[PDB]
Structure 1
Amino acid sequence: QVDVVVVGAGFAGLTAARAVHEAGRSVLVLEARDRVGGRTCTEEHHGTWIDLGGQWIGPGQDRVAALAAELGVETYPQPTEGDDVVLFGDGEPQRAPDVALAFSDEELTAYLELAGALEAIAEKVPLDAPWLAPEAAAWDATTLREWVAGTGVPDRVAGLFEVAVQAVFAATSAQLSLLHAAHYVHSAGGWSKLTDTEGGAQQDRLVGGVQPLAERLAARLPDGALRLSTPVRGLAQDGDGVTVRTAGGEVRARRAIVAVPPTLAGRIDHDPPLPPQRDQLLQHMPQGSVVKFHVIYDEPWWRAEGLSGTVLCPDEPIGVTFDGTPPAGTPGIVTGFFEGPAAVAAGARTREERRDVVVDVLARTLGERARDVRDYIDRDWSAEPWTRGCYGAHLPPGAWTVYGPALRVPVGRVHWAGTETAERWTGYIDGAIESGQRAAAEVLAALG
């Protein structure tokens, strides 16, 4: 009987396991995949790292910053310089030193007042208990889209905001409760923290990619602690401990930490069954929809034309793009996303069809050289059986107030981690690390 079994070797499960180990307790980590990292995933292509999952860290994300400094992983900055390209409907593409400058003064004022009003709501939502916001009932009964419509902003401001909503949540403003969106904004420290490159969540990348950071963290566990390719099928508990059922047999432990996405946590055969509020909470925490891609060129040819590699095209299937080129300055990479409904349409299509859509948008925005592609690499996170959607879960109207209170509460000897249980930077790597520290501290107090 080990002291603690951890289900999942993402940043949450690995953080919890390392904290249990460092306190002197025995720990086993059971991971479904043949690798650690979960929603972070890095492959070597064209002599560099391709981050197919989470890739960016930014100011305010102190837990991931500290971990990367501890384990010796250096950062490099997201490129910021050169003209962004903005494309509206059937128009001609517009080059601007920033996205902002493609909108009128009145439009920019309406956008900043809309963001400001969402921040003023956010600041009233308690990070540990969104259901205890003074206006929780009203805010939980309203979609973000209904709230945006009630502000009277112009069409183009609503469309620009919607690009930002889809880029952050991997879901439309109609899918999200206003209470969910407000908690998320509060959790990150503001709308600028979510949407900015410099000063925001997209500021910095990790040299070598993110999955090798998770690997360095797993290398702090003793040999024998990690079991890969070992999906957890069942989790039983009684007065004396827990029993974990796998295809290849059973593990006995005193306590468990389940650190997987909510929809996957619900699919485990729990004995006794989870209490009904927690089962229905997981039914009400759907994962987002995102296809992430990297278009590979021999060189970042856009930079010589004075372009950043960032395109903003509210009427196209892809959202914002980014220059994904490593510090070596080759190969050239354009990074971007299909989000929400576009991700679901694109996921039903082949890699080749997705390639063709992306290359066509870039050809009409960055220029005709976009057609001279070396390679196109993508990942539909909704098709990953051990994730079933990126970036993370969202909550539709009525879920946070009625089912939300069951989010973190241990069920007997079973404790919960994962980015979706974080108070700060929920949905991000930094939040996953928070959640593992919290679950470890709970289990260590319970064993003692």
Structure 2
Amino acid sequence: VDVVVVGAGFAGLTAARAVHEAGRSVLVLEARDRVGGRTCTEEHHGTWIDLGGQWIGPGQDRVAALAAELGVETYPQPTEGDDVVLFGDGEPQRAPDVALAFSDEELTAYLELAGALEAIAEKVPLDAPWLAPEAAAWDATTLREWVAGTGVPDRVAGLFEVAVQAVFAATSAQLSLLHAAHYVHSAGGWSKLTDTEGGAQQDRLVGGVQPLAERLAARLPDGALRLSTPVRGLAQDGDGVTVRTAGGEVRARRAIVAVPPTLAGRIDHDPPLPPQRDQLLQHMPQGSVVKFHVIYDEPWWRAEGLSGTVLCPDEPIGVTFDGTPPAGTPGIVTGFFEGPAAVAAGARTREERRDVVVDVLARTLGERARDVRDYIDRDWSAEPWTRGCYGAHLPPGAWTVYGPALRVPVGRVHWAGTETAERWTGYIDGAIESGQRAAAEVLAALG
């Protein structure tokens, strides 16, 4: 074949397609028995359950183009109802929006802390974070260190910490300031990452995200997609690339590897990857998230005038969301254990995580939250073919020293994945970008 793509996520599949329609031969070798990767949809209780990525919002041009091209309808994330905020061994507070549980002072400082991180972000080149003028200072500094500088009160530092852990699936301490700043630039600012209406959590897909990936996969000729076919090894010479699977061997001119960084370095590369790139991947840890859907017979919180959104900065769950489909049943409360609370939850059983979620909801939405019909969750850290969501972060010292290896081809081996995107890195939209860019590269470099 002309091109072998490793991975049938949105990055893999988008690269495989652009290569196919250009007039070139391609195989996609995928480890799982399905497509979609970090997107994954299961039917439960008469509706779709997005165990992985579910949300699209404005500014995400490429996924909105894909959904529309392939005949997939969207519905809004519900917005109406009183939100509940809970601090410490305090009582729960009902407001028409989270924001209105904080003082005048507290809100000011919050929006000024966001406005401040955006200032840094705007100066970070999306294609080359290492080339910001303040790159030295910013890559030696954690986000936590920077927040502590702002001299913001504990309750505004707590609120900002819930938003950090909900966006990166890692604490402010794990991230370089330069990584955080690049990610905010990439998304078009803090409100773009955090908001529902006008934000990344604005819209969902009717029937869920995994079907959109399947529709993209059906644009490939029969025999192009190989499922349950993990790539163990990747060899290359001046003539082409030999892909060793278990029970088979594939031979192409060039390769696109579209897996999560930590899985990319697990492949037996021959010759061995250059050291800057091998060490970049040792410095690109995946985040830590357990995503859950609490299932009730009905969205009983709405009848109390409640949105179903709780925000508890001291609880092991950060933010919740009404995940009820457009038909109005079953009622769903969707949420996440993020960073350290996700690692602790992952070490426990399904039933122990259910009891923690239901306890928090009972003390916020109401005691009726213990009357659960079903609980459905996924630890993406446990998934051998992801090993953490939503994607990689870089700790201090990674971006300026190993980061330049991010996108550079090694010979005939090219790189895709949301982690290689300029815009909405970390999101489906970013995956799509990476696919388009990796394919353009291989068409150019081939003929």
The TM-score by the shorter chain falls in which range?
over 0.9
Give CA-to-partner distance per residue, 1:383-438, whole Å, 9 cap, x none.
Answer: 00000000000000000000000000000000000000000000000000000000
Q: Could you list the per-position Cα deviations for residues 243-300 of structure 1 after superposition, in whole angstroms to 9, with x for gaps in the alignment? A: 0000111100000000000000000000000000000000000000000000000010
Q: Deviation at 1:219?
A: 0.5
Residue deviations 1:90-136, cap 9 Å, x none? Answer: 01100001000000000000000000000000000000000000000
Distance in 2 (CA, whole Å) between partners of 1:86 and 1:319 is 10
Partner of 2:217: 218
Counterpart CA distance in 1 for 2:312 and 2:180 is: 23
Q: Which runs of 5+ in 2 are unaligned?
A: none
**Equivalenced residues, count:** 447
1:363-397 CA-to-partner distances (Å, cap 9, x unmatched) read 10000110110000000000000000000000000
For 1:86 and 1:225, locate their aligned partners in 2 and report how far apart those are by CA, in whole Å.
Answer: 50
Displaced runs of 4+ in structure 1, greater than 2 A?
A: none
- Name the SS for the 1:365 alignment partner: coil
Q: Distance in 1 between matches of 2:303 and 2:218?
A: 42
What is the aligned partner in structure 2 of residue 236 from structure 1? 235
In structure 2, distance between residues paired with 1:54 and 1:427: 10
Q: Which runs of 5+ in 1 are unaligned?
A: none
Give the match's secondary structure for 1:243. strand
Aligned mates of 2:96, 2:191 — CA distance in 1: 18
Deviation at residue 162 of structure 1 after TM alignment: 0.1
SS in 1 for 2:301: helix
> Is the partner of 1:164 in helix, strand or coil?
helix
Q: What secondary structure sits across from 1:366 in the alignment?
A: coil
Find the aligned partners of 1:273 and 1:178 in 2 and give their Cα distance: 31
Tell me the equivalent position of 1:165: 164
The answer to whether the aligner puts 1:286 opposite 2:285 as a matched pair is: yes
RMSD: 0.3
Q: Secondary structure at the match of 2:32?
A: coil
Percent of paired sites with the same residue: 100
For 1:31 and 1:37, the matched residues in 2 are separated by 10
- For residues 239 and 294 of structure 1, the distance between their equivalents in structure 2, rounded to whole angstroms, comes to 50
Return the alpha-carbon distance in structure 1 between the equivalents of residues 408 and 328 of structure 2: 48
Normalization by structure 1: what TM-score?
Answer: 1.00
2:251 matched to which residue of 1? 252
**Matched residue, 1:365:** 364
Displacement of 1:157 = 0.4
Separation in structure 1 between the aligned mates of residue 434 and residue 282 of structure 2, nearest angstrom: 21
Provide the rounded CA distance (Å) in 2 between the counterparts of 1:48 and 1:211: 13
Please state how far the C-alpha of 1:168 moved relative to its aligned partner: 0.1
**C-alpha distance in 2 between matches for 1:111 and 1:33:** 42
- In the TM superposition, residue 74 of structure 1 has moved relative to its aligned partner by 0.3
Q: Find the residue that maps to 2:308 and give its secondary structure.
A: strand
SS of residue in 2 equivalent to 1:56: coil
Deviation at 1:315, TM superposition (A): 0.7
Q: What secondary structure, in the 3-state scheme, does the structure 2 residue paired with 1:432 have?
A: helix
What is the CA–CA distance in structure 1 between the aligned matches of 2:155 and 2:370, rounded to whole Å? 29
TM value normalised by structure 2: 1.00
Separation (CA, whole Å) in 2 of partners of 1:316 and 1:114: 23
How far apart, CA to CA, are the structure 1 residues paired with 2:153 and 2:356?
A: 29
Q: Identify the residue that residue 65 of structure 1 maps to in structure 2.
A: 64
Q: Tell me, in whole angstroms, the C-alpha distance in 1 between the residues paired with 2:314 and 2:239.
A: 58
Deviation, 1:309, is 0.3
SS at match of 1:281: helix
- Tell me which residue corresponds to 2:414: 415
Map Cα deviations across residues 135-194 of structure 1 (whole Å, 9 max, x no partner).
Answer: 000000000000000110000000000000000000000000000000000000000000
In structure 1, distance between residues paired with 2:268 and 2:33: 22
Q: Deviations over 1:328-354 (max 9, x none)?
A: 100000000000000000000000000
| Aligned twin of 1:447 | 446
Separation of aligned partners in 1, 2:318 and 2:204 = 20
Quote how far apart the aligned CAs of 1:213 are.
Answer: 0.3
Give the whole-Å Cα distance in 2 for the aligned partners of 1:225 and 1:303: 47
Give SS of 2:212's match.
helix
**SS state of the match for residue 162, structure 1?**
helix
Which whole-Å CA distance do the structure 2 matches of 1:391 and 1:43 have between them? 19
Distance in structure 2 (CA, Å) of the matches to 1:96 and 1:268:
51
1-structure distance, mates of 2:444, 2:136: 34
**Partner Cα distance (2:95, 2:268) in 1:** 54
Alignment partners' CA distance in 2, 1:243 and 1:249: 11
Distance (whole Å) between structure 2 residues aligned to residue 387 and residue 226 of structure 1 = 19
